[PDB]
Amino acid sequence: MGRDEAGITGTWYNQLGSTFIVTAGADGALTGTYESAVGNAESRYVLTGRYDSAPATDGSGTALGWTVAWKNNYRNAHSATTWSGQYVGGAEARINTQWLLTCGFTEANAWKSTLVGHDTFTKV
Amino acid sequence: MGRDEAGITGTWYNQLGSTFIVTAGADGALTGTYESAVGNAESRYVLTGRYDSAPATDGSGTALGWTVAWKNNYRNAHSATTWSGQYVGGAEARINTQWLLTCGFTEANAWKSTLVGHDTFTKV
Amino acid sequence: MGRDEAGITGTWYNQLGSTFIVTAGADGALTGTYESAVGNAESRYVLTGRYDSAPATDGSGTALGWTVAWKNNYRNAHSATTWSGQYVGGAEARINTQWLLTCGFTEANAWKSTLVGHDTFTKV
Amino acid sequence: MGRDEAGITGTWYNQLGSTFIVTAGADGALTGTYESAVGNAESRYVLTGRYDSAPATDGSGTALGWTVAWKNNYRNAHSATTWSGQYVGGAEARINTQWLLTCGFTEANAWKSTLVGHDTFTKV
Numbered sequence A, B, C, D: 001m002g003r004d005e006a007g008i009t010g011t012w013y014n015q016l017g018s019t020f021i022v023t024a025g026a027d028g029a030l031t032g033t034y035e036s037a038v039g040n041a042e043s044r045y046v047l048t049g050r051y052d053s054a055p056a057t058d059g060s061g062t063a064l065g066w067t068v069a070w071k072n073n074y075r076n077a078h079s080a081t082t083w084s085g086q087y088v089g090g091a092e093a094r095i096n097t098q099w100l101l102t103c104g105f106t107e108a109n110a111w112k113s114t115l116v117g118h119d120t121f122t123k124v
């Protein structure tokens, strides 16, 4: 059992109103679905990732990350986002992330292929 | 069958001499192992990710991403890296990425928790 | 006179309690001092940057950026931070930024040379 | 006199074929012009920045950064780029950077306001 397996598993919301539904496995796996409130997206997309299933016990956060490729049965935005961040437990648990969204572009446009941002997820 | 399922599946090397061994599934899954030539790492770590399994056919790259949590049976660096990028096919295939490495830190050190970099993977 | 010359000029505070004191020139220059509440820093450091002195008038923010090299008469942390972001006017004006902190490192450690984060500045 | 004042001052080119013309001052100032080979840009734009004028002498690079706001007498792309990186001296001197390009956008589009990339500058 990962230390924060129960704390991570569940439904999370970010500041854009997107919905992140995840299950943390005892082995460090993250599996679930993502629904983005913004951009070229509709409904749920598959996500997978990893988390540190034996974090430090000195008050540090729990490192994790996951990926969504923005293809599902409704749309294909030819892009992928990875979120990299940490789970912070407690009364108001949070997942604090930064993210990289890469679009599949021609070689001449590679310089403008990647957006960077930051999302904060909470359980309410 | 994903368009670039065969082109992605296999063993990749980046400019640091790290080894990225991946299988692309027809459904958009990436599964495999990562071995980093640098940092607080030894041997292979589980990785999972996603890729666009029906990319555009106008010469654009194929968007993808994956995560490694830096825990295995030898070490735990209490951190996770996500790579976000695109697969570029052809005679000298490449996966061009940018990445975010987040460490699990205390709340007071969250400002210095995340490194950013860029890795280029080739098949030789 | 830049459109937001008066709105930008002045004293700003971020969520870490750092102090950003800036003057915007009519030509697009930013000049001032930065005092960081965290890290290897003490007192004020010179900053310089640029801003869009004729922004759009459709409600968009005003793009800007600036650099601090972390050397002053007290300390030298052999590093530089650049903030890239936008000034958002109104009752609760804000400068929303993302930033890159690069340390001068040996060639073998270049992969871990750059931190990424995000700072929000307000006038109170 | 900054340690790398002479090594930095001059004309640099990146992998896109952009031209970075800079003067390093003894006080740590960077001043000059930037001409981008790509994007919504034409001719030269003002740049300003800072560099560590007393770097370590253990083989580490010299940290620096600079900003361009993409307004000049020809065009205004309502955006700013900051480059954060290090000067690496020697036979084939280099400035290795990562950069953040922020567009002035409405509040609803702030999530897609910032591109991230990496540029390598050389003297030839």
Ligand SMILES: O=C(CCCC[C@@H]1SC[C@@H]2NC(=O)N[C@@H]21)NCCCN(CCc1ccccn1)CCc1ccccn1
Residues within 6 Å of the ligand: A014, A016, A018, A035, A036, A037, A038, A039, A040, A041, A070, A077, A078, A079, A081, A099, A101, A103, A112, A113, A114, A115, A117, A119, D111, D112
């Ligand atoms: O939206 C998508 C998929 C949805 C992305 C949702 C993002 S994930 C990070 C964040 N957290 C979140 O909860 N929600 C957002 N994938 C293509 C992302 C194209 N751009 C901007 C949007 C757009 C939508 C429709 C038409 C054109 N654009 C990327 C920026 C860019 C780069 C270069 C040239 C032009 N544009």
Ligand SMILES: O=C(CCCC[C@@H]1SC[C@@H]2NC(=O)N[C@@H]21)NCCCN(CCc1ccccn1)CCc1ccccn1
Residues within 6 Å of the ligand: B014, B016, B018, B035, B036, B037, B038, B039, B040, B041, B070, B077, B078, B079, B081, B099, B101, B103, B112, B113, B114, B115, B117, B119, C111, C112
């Ligand atoms: O190394 C790791 C795991 C290995 C990471 C390998 C990276 S993935 C991106 C890149 N592509 C690649 O192929 N290989 C590298 N995880 C903790 C990463 C701690 N820092 C730097 C390294 C280190 C090793 C040992 C002791 C201290 N550090 C992060 C930087 C930081 C931030 C704040 C304070 C101090 N340091």
Ligand SMILES: O=C(CCCC[C@@H]1SC[C@@H]2NC(=O)N[C@@H]21)NCCCN(CCc1ccccn1)CCc1ccccn1
Residues within 6 Å of the ligand: B111, B112, C014, C016, C018, C035, C036, C037, C038, C039, C040, C041, C070, C077, C078, C079, C081, C099, C101, C103, C112, C113, C114, C115, C117, C119
């Ligand atoms: O603090 C500095 C200068 C102050 C930086 C303040 C930052 S600007 C962005 C942000 N907004 C803000 O208002 N305040 C912060 N420059 C060296 C920054 C060394 N690291 C972490 C701090 C530290 C302080 C003392 C001793 C060791 N570290 C960088 C992370 C790293 C990378 C690789 C290996 C180890 N560590």
Ligand SMILES: O=C(CCCC[C@@H]1SC[C@@H]2NC(=O)N[C@@H]21)NCCCN(CCc1ccccn1)CCc1ccccn1
Residues within 6 Å of the ligand: A111, A112, D014, D016, D018, D035, D036, D037, D038, D039, D040, D041, D070, D077, D078, D079, D081, D099, D101, D103, D112, D113, D114, D115, D117, D119
């Ligand atoms: O080009 C500019 C100014 C030139 C930028 C040149 C860049 S600096 C980093 C890099 N190193 C370099 O040497 N050269 C490049 N400023 C607006 C940058 C708009 N986007 C992409 C380009 C574009 C040109 C014309 C029309 C539309 N786009 C940003 C991506 C985005 C985000 C959200 C929605 C849509 N697009």
Ligand SMILES: [Cu+2]
Residues within 6 Å of the ligand: A055, A056, B076, B078
């Ligand atoms: Cu430990």
Ligand SMILES: [Cu+2]
Residues within 6 Å of the ligand: A096, A097, A098, A118, C118
């Ligand atoms: Cu954050």
Ligand SMILES: [Cu+2]
Residues within 6 Å of the ligand: none
């Ligand atoms: Cu654009």
Ligand SMILES: [Cu+2]
Residues within 6 Å of the ligand: A076, A078, B055, B056
């Ligand atoms: Cu399509």
Ligand SMILES: [Cu+2]
Residues within 6 Å of the ligand: B096, B097, B098, B118, D118
């Ligand atoms: Cu790249």
Ligand SMILES: [Cu+2]
Residues within 6 Å of the ligand: none
């Ligand atoms: Cu440090």
Ligand SMILES: [Cu+2]
Residues within 6 Å of the ligand: C055, C056, D076, D078
């Ligand atoms: Cu305009």
Ligand SMILES: [Cu+2]
Residues within 6 Å of the ligand: A118, C096, C097, C098, C118
């Ligand atoms: Cu922001």
Ligand SMILES: [Cu+2]
Residues within 6 Å of the ligand: none
């Ligand atoms: Cu470290």
Ligand SMILES: [Cu+2]
Residues within 6 Å of the ligand: C076, C078, D055, D056
């Ligand atoms: Cu020193």
Ligand SMILES: [Cu+2]
Residues within 6 Å of the ligand: B118, D096, D097, D098, D118
């Ligand atoms: Cu670099």
Ligand SMILES: [Cu+2]
Residues within 6 Å of the ligand: none
């Ligand atoms: Cu777009």
